[PDB]
Amino acid sequence: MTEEERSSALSEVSLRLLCHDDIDTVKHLCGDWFPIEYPDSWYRDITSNKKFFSLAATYRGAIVGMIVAEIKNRTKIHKEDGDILASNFSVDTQVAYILSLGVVKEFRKHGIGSLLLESLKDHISTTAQDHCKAIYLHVLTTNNTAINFYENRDFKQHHYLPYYYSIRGVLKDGFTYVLYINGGHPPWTILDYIQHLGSALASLSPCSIPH
Ligand SMILES: CC(=O)SCCNC(=O)CCNC(=O)[C@H](O)C(C)(C)COP(=O)(O)OP(=O)(O)OC[C@H]1O[C@@H](n2cnc3c(N)ncnc32)[C@H](O)[C@@H]1OP(=O)(O)O
């Protein structure tokens, strides 16, 4: 391996947004990555609609991983996950949904998935720090590799969703995972919250509190 070969290697991996020309490649990869099936509309939307943050990692120009997400108003969360954020956050409050994350199997366990997730966080910080208060996604309950990846990155299991998915026509369970950011938190009734509060304030010395 020449020094010239070493220098070249440094520009080989890069990141870019998806485009419409990507659709056929993205379909092939997704067919490998996920045992579920996405409709044609999904591929067209993720590649072409600017509302999505669709980010590819490439090696020698070829896509080797992607993360696809949507930053959207809290009201757009689907009903099964409607309880992710407290409803007294501002009407302008947003969340980020991860539609998809995948890395070609050959390239796994080199940090690509991690960098894609980090890039989405960086994009949120750049674009929507004022309003985005959670990141959420779904996995198959059987997907230990994904579960571990998310749990080790501080996402927490939020809901159990029975028969959420179809693999070759056979229904399979899912989980919702959530990471709160920028002060996001789940809904509480006031009465429940005040009960919880006693544990939170316990650390305060009685002497420090006016009485
Ligand atoms: C909407 C959804 O989220 S769908 C669910 C996610 N997608 C899938 O399950 C599709 C199939 N699976 C995949 O595509 C991959 O397995 C992914 C996306 C889950 C992870 O992608 P990867 O590129 O392998 O992730 P990454 O390399 O960052 O980290 C994975 C493991 O590799 C290890 N790792 C990280 N960096 C390195 C490294 N530099 N060298 C060796 N190992 C590393 C860590 O042990 C990490 O382990 P952990 O998961 O226990 O924390």
Expressed in angstroms and rounded, the spacing between residue 200 Cα and the centre of ligand 1 is 35
Q: Does 57 sit in the ligand 1 pocket, CB within 6 Å?
A: no
* Nearest C-alpha neighbor of 75 from the set 87, 63, 66, 65: 87
* Nearest C-alpha neighbor of 113 from the set 147, 161, 72, 71: 147
Catalytic residue among 131, 136, 138, 177: 138
Contact by Cβ (8 Å): 132, 140: no
Q: Does 2 sit in the ligand 1 pocket, CB within 6 Å?
A: no
This structure's resolution (Å) is: 1.4
Active site residue 138: yes
Expressed in angstroms and rounded, the spacing between residue 176 Cα and the centre of ligand 1 is 18
Contact by Cβ (8 Å): 68, 43: no
The C-alpha angle 106, 151, 88, rounded to 5 degrees, equals: 130
Three-state SS string over 5-25 comes to HHHHHCCCEEEEECCHHHHHH
Q: Does 119 sit in the ligand 1 pocket, CB within 6 Å?
A: no
Burial class, 139, CB count within 10 angstroms (exposed 0-12 / middle 13-18 / buried 19+): buried
Binding site members: 38, 99, 101-103, 109-114, 143, 150-153, 165
Give the residue, out of 58, 63, 114, with the most ligand 1 atoms within 8 A of its beta carbon, to mutate for a pocket test: 114
Which DSSP string do the residues of the chain spell out, in sequence order? --HHHHHHHTTSEEEEE--GGGHHHHHHHHHHH-SS---HHHHHHHHH-TTEEEEEEEETTEEEEEEEEEEEEGGGS-GGGTTSS-TTS-TT-EEEEEEEEEE-GGGTTSSHHHHHHHHHHHHHHHHHTTTEEEEEEEEETT-HHHHHHHHTTT-EEEEEEEEEEEETTEEEEEEEEEEE-TT------HHHHHHHHHHHHTTS-GGGS--
Task: Report which protein residue has its CA nearest ligand 1's atom 47.
Answer: 149
Q: For the domain 3-208, what is the CATH superfamily, name and number?
A: Gcn5-related N-acetyltransferase (GNAT) (3.40.630.30)
Experimental method: X-ray
Expressed in angstroms and rounded, the spacing between residue 150 Cα and the centre of ligand 1 is 9
